[PDB]
Swiss-Prot record:
NADP(+) binds at residues 10-19, 211-273. The lineage of its organism: Eukaryota, Metazoa, Chordata, Craniata, Vertebrata. Highly expressed in embryonic epithelial cells (EUE) in response to osmotic stress. The modification Phosphoserine is found at S3. This is Aldo-keto reductase family 1 member B1.
């Protein structure tokens, strides 16, 4: 298992990164410090996570301590939905860079294919609970992303939560300057994404799997919901390898030639989650895990389902 994958810009992206959604600012600095100490070189960030300053503190300290060099780190962030207007994109990227204390990102993603009304709120709702869209479109937002590459703010650009038709829209743009390098999508044994992965990989786009542990800390979880980490079938596969269920869930996407970004703020778990380069899932294991697909999505906000660019009405 090679630890990095080649992107379309010639850069290599570590296949294991640290997720930071729901990592509170009072804990995320320590999490990132520990992650860097134990070998993580990829950090997945976003403005909407409200913790980029604290991620930035940790990176800066480890650079200053001579633990890592900037060129060895792969820092990803994402353009939030309220900044899709062409005139807002650069400032959103620069705010992220300032918070992270960086002079470039390795990868910058369109976080979701939908634009929301610009303003202070991340989730502007009307009086009846519907998200308030903006009149922006995917291609104009992509053009603004391309400018960030041209100006040296970001080394690569990509997309997240795009369906295959939305990806195709960008690929087919007349006068396209940069192809998306990455599509970051939810992916785990209950949402295996076979068709979208096949699509993306056939078009030379690297897929990153988010919520690989099933995001048990997601704020809308219901007790009746399926739980990957507690699935006794996955426990049994883990036991056979003398690994944890999380380690199995992280290794699974790696063997599908995906990048994977498990989140933790717990130091023991951050270290555990990295110890996935010392075993292999068998062909039967892989087949069995894929068989658990239920098309069950843990990230898809009800209030957004009437947006014109809502991604999940399409089959894939
Ligand atoms: N692009 C997007 O739209 C998008 C959407 C969702 C997620 N993401 C990215 O993907 C990352 C990962 O997804 P996620 O945060 O939704 O969830 P996840 O990584 O599937 O699960 C994180 C949860 O699992 C727990 N956990 C971690 N390691 C564990 C272990 N070894 N044993 C038991 N429990 C463990 C964590 O607890 P503790 O932290 O308390 O240890 C946390 O509650 C995010 O943080 C974000 O960076 C991107
Ligand atoms: O965003 C993250 O990284 C994690 C994430 N996910 N979700 C669920 C979402 N579902 C969406 C669906 C659309 C849609 F495109 F479908 F309209 C657009 C935007 C969203 S946010 C959230 O509600 C959220 C809130 C704060 C911080 C991060 C998140």
């Amino acid at each position: 298992m090679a630890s990095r994958i080649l992107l379309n810009n010639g850069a290599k992206m570590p296949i294991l990164g640290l997720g930071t959604w729901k990592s509170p600012p009072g804990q995320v600095t320590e999490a990132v410090k520990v992650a860097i100490d134990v070998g993580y070189r990829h950090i997945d960030c976003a403005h909407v996570y409200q913790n980029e300053n604290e991620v930035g503190v940790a990176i800066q300290e480890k650079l200053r301590e001579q633990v890592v060099k900037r060129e060895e780190l792969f820092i990803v962030s994402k353009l939030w939905c309220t900044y899709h207007e062409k005139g807002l994109v650069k400032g959103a990227c620069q705010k992220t860079l300032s918070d992270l204390k960086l002079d470039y990102l390795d990868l910058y993603l369109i976080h979701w294919p939908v634009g929301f009304k610009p303003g202070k709120e991340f989730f502007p709702l009307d009086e009846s609970g519907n998200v308030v869209p903006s009149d922006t479109n995917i291609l104009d937002t992509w053009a603004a992303m391309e400018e960030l590459v041209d100006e040296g703010l970001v080394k690569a650009i990509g997309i997240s939560n795009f369906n295959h038709l939305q990806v195709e829209m960008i690929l087919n743009k007349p006068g396209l300057k940069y192809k998306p390098a990455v599509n970051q999508i939810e992916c785990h044994p209950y949402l295996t994404q076979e068709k979208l992965i096949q699509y993306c990989q056939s078009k030379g786009i690297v897929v990153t799997a988010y919520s690989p542990l099933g995001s048990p800390d997601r704020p809308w979880a219901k007790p009746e919901d399926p739980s990957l980490l507690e699935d006794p079938r996955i426990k049994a596969i883990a036991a056979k390898h003398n690994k944890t269920t999380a380690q199995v869930l992280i290794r699974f996407p790696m063997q599908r030639n995906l990048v994977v970004i498990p989140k933790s703020v717990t130091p023991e778990r951050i270290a555990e989650n990295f110890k996935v380069f010392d075993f292999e899932l068998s062909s039967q294991d892989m087949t069995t895990l894929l068989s658990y697909n239920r098309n069950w999505r843990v990230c898809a906000l009800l209030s957004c389902t009437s947006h014109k660019d809502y991604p999940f009405h399409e089959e894939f």
